[PDB]
Design an enzyme around this catalytic site. Structure first.
Site, mmCIF file in Angstrom:
data_model
loop_
_atom_site.group_PDB
_atom_site.id
_atom_site.type_symbol
_atom_site.label_atom_id
_atom_site.label_comp_id
_atom_site.label_asym_id
_atom_site.label_seq_id
_atom_site.Cartn_x
_atom_site.Cartn_y
_atom_site.Cartn_z
ATOM 1 N N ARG A 170 15.604 85.874 57.437
ATOM 2 C CA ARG A 170 14.909 84.628 57.153
ATOM 3 C C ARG A 170 14.185 84.752 55.807
ATOM 4 O O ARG A 170 13.241 84.006 55.530
ATOM 5 C CB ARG A 170 13.913 84.310 58.266
ATOM 6 C CG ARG A 170 14.593 83.887 59.567
ATOM 7 C CD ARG A 170 13.700 84.217 60.755
ATOM 8 N NE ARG A 170 14.288 83.740 61.999
ATOM 9 C CZ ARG A 170 14.076 84.273 63.200
ATOM 10 N NH1 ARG A 170 13.289 85.332 63.349
ATOM 11 N NH2 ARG A 170 14.672 83.759 64.266
ATOM 12 N N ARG A 171 14.647 85.675 54.969
ATOM 13 C CA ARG A 171 13.981 85.995 53.699
ATOM 14 C C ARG A 171 14.926 85.858 52.496
ATOM 15 O O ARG A 171 14.707 86.446 51.440
ATOM 16 C CB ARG A 171 13.500 87.452 53.753
ATOM 17 C CG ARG A 171 12.456 87.706 54.812
ATOM 18 C CD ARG A 171 12.156 89.178 54.974
ATOM 19 N NE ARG A 171 11.256 89.424 56.084
ATOM 20 C CZ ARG A 171 10.672 90.591 56.307
ATOM 21 N NH1 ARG A 171 10.858 91.605 55.461
ATOM 22 N NH2 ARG A 171 9.863 90.737 57.347
ATOM 23 N N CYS A 190 11.106 73.117 37.277
ATOM 24 C CA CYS A 190 11.035 71.864 38.047
ATOM 25 C C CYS A 190 11.727 72.107 39.368
ATOM 26 O O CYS A 190 11.121 71.927 40.432
ATOM 27 C CB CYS A 190 11.737 70.697 37.334
ATOM 28 S SG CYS A 190 10.918 70.143 35.847
ATOM 29 N N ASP A 215 11.805 63.323 38.015
ATOM 30 C CA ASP A 215 12.095 61.957 37.689
ATOM 31 C C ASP A 215 13.246 61.561 38.633
ATOM 32 O O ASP A 215 14.370 62.082 38.505
ATOM 33 C CB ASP A 215 12.536 61.911 36.222
ATOM 34 C CG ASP A 215 13.038 60.564 35.796
ATOM 35 O OD1 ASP A 215 13.384 59.703 36.636
ATOM 36 O OD2 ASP A 215 13.116 60.372 34.548
ATOM 37 N N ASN A 223 19.875 67.502 39.552
ATOM 38 C CA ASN A 223 19.478 68.608 40.403
ATOM 39 C C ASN A 223 20.228 68.622 41.769
ATOM 40 O O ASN A 223 20.514 69.674 42.303
ATOM 41 C CB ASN A 223 17.940 68.613 40.581
ATOM 42 C CG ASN A 223 17.179 68.873 39.254
ATOM 43 O OD1 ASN A 223 16.175 68.222 38.977
ATOM 44 N ND2 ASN A 223 17.698 69.736 38.409
ATOM 45 N N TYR A 255 9.625 56.523 36.138
ATOM 46 C CA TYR A 255 8.999 56.083 34.887
ATOM 47 C C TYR A 255 9.107 54.563 34.727
ATOM 48 O O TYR A 255 10.120 53.950 35.088
ATOM 49 C CB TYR A 255 9.660 56.790 33.708
ATOM 50 C CG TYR A 255 9.218 58.205 33.533
ATOM 51 C CD1 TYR A 255 8.113 58.521 32.757
ATOM 52 C CD2 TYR A 255 9.893 59.231 34.149
ATOM 53 C CE1 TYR A 255 7.702 59.834 32.599
ATOM 54 C CE2 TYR A 255 9.492 60.537 34.004
ATOM 55 C CZ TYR A 255 8.392 60.836 33.230
ATOM 56 O OH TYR A 255 7.987 62.142 33.073
#
Lengths: 312, 290
Positions: A170-171, A190, A215, A223, A255
């Site tokens: 779990r690491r 980010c 954003d 991403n 924005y």
């Protein structure tokens, strides 16, 4: 991707306005969660800059700190941060043109880890060296003899090793937020923390990705693409089918100068998600039984392709 | 309600390994509406972390016994050469939050880098030659949490107000690696509301979740008090969300108000910045009524 459009709607309907030049409307804390077996989370209400996003991810996998190398990978998104950002141009850690500092993949693959040990702490020294630390200096401090040990820690490769060796762990995570070097880089992470979660019963692997700030209009789609692609590459090299991709956002905002654009997207009829194909030349660990984590470096942007991508 | 939906989802769709789990869950609570032996133990843990405690004894004095077994019975840790002795945990959690050991190796003639580092609180601790170059080692014990409080007061529109406990360089020196891992504060200066996002890599949804929720809510309440913001959203992000088989009976069957003592001064009322309250606050300052 309805969830994505719903996030945009939620921010516009429940967010609050804030100043920072250009105002933003935002909410604290959101989740998008995708089943990659149902398709790749490409935006369809506009054109996803897929090759740019894949280029950026490959750059990070290679611990790239040059915008020229990003450009060679089909990715121009670092050019302004490297060469026009006034604060970075004034930063004494910037080596010159196209330099970004040790951003993102440098921390993922080459995190600079140090220990300062007593020179005669033999058991600690032996343990650290067994784990890949090496002694780089001997010095006196407080009238005690010390050794400095260093390891460029490859968190991502360590994660792949753990997936193959110990999938119930779990690491299995890495991240790019190194407090010691926030002052040395063009931009702080980010997309911050990535955790892999193998399921042995199902031979599936999932990813949870923590995003400090997005954003939602311009950044989130990029991403999403990168995180989904990473999970797909990792599954290929570790013998698991990619399944859940959970995207957690801290500061989710839009924005003000994007509102008109986003409003027009909200009205468009979305398309079915496309499928991501990773090229056959990237060997499948489940088929070969040969562990070949060097493919983290050997993979090229051209090895990632979308099938059936339809968009406005 | 949200909590019970997560329980139902895990039970109906999770995979067994005994524990049953799913990957990726979120709980999100509005602390202005209400709080989401157990409570006092969680508060004792939080105060211990705030004080950069590495001793299970110090946690016990604060009302928290949850570290004893990891300090004194875990076979791997007992064999670890960084363990100092009984009750030691290594530089877990709060030591990283408050005193993260940050190093730089710079060229000895990189004057502008060295000057910049010194201005930010780094100090030169060693000089040495490596690869034919003269180098300097600089060090700062980085107080990420204090840095956060400072940034909330100085520059609340920053989207970089976060700290975490996952230091890759010391994962081999500690009794357990950070589970409740990353904390991000999100001040809204127009509403003077502050929110928290917490990333937890692994959580027992039965007994672990209530504990971690208490600690997170308490921390947001303290931070708001000391920086001039009312707590609002607490978003709780979980990687490995699981339930123990041995708890099914209990879960099958299945708000109060948090108060932080008035003696902890309110920055919005005093105008006096007193971040030293991170060390002065006591478990008794936190109460759960109703």
């Amino acid at each position: 991707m309805k969830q994505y459009l719903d996030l945009v709607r939620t921010i516009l309907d429940t967010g609050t306005w804030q100043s920072n030049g250009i105002r933003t409307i935002g909410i604290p804390g959101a989740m998008l969660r995708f089943d990659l077996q149902q398709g790749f989370p490409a935006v369809t209400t506009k054109k996803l800059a897929f090759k740019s996003a894949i280029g950026e991810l490959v750059g990070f996998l290679r611990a790239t700190r040059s915008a020229a190398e990003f450009r060679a990978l089909g990715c121009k998104v670092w050019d302004a941060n490297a060469n026009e950002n006034a604060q970075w141009l004034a930063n004494p850690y910037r080596r010159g043109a196209d330099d970004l500092g040790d951003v993102y993949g440098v921390q993922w693959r080459r995190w600079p880890g140090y220990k300062v040990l007593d020179a005669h702490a033999d058991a600690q020294i032996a343990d650290a060296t067994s784990r890949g630390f090496r002694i780089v200096a001997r010095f006196e401090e407080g009238g005690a003899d010390k050794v400095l040990l260093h390891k460029a820690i490859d968190q991502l490769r360590d994660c792949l090793d753990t997936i193959v060796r110990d999938p119930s762990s779990r690491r299995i995570l890495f991240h790019g937020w190194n407090p010691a070097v926030l002052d040395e880089i063009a931009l702080p992470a980010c997309h911050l923390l990535y955790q892999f979660l193998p399921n042995v019963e199902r031979r599936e692997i999932s990813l949870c990705l923590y995003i400090r700030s997005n954003d939602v209009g311009l950044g989130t789609p990029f991403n999403l693409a990168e995180g989904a692609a990473l999970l797909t590459l990792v599954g290929r090299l570790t013998g698991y089918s990619p399944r859940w991709f959970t995207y957690f956002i801290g500061d989710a905002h839009i924005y003000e100068n994007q509102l008109d654009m986003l409003k027009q997207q909200l009205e468009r009829e979305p398309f079915e998600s496309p499928r991501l194909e990773l090229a056959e030349r990237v060997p499948d660990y489940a088929k070969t039984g040969k562990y070949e984590p060097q493919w983290l470096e050997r993979v090229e942007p051209s090895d990632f392709t979308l099938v059936g991508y339809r968009h406005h």
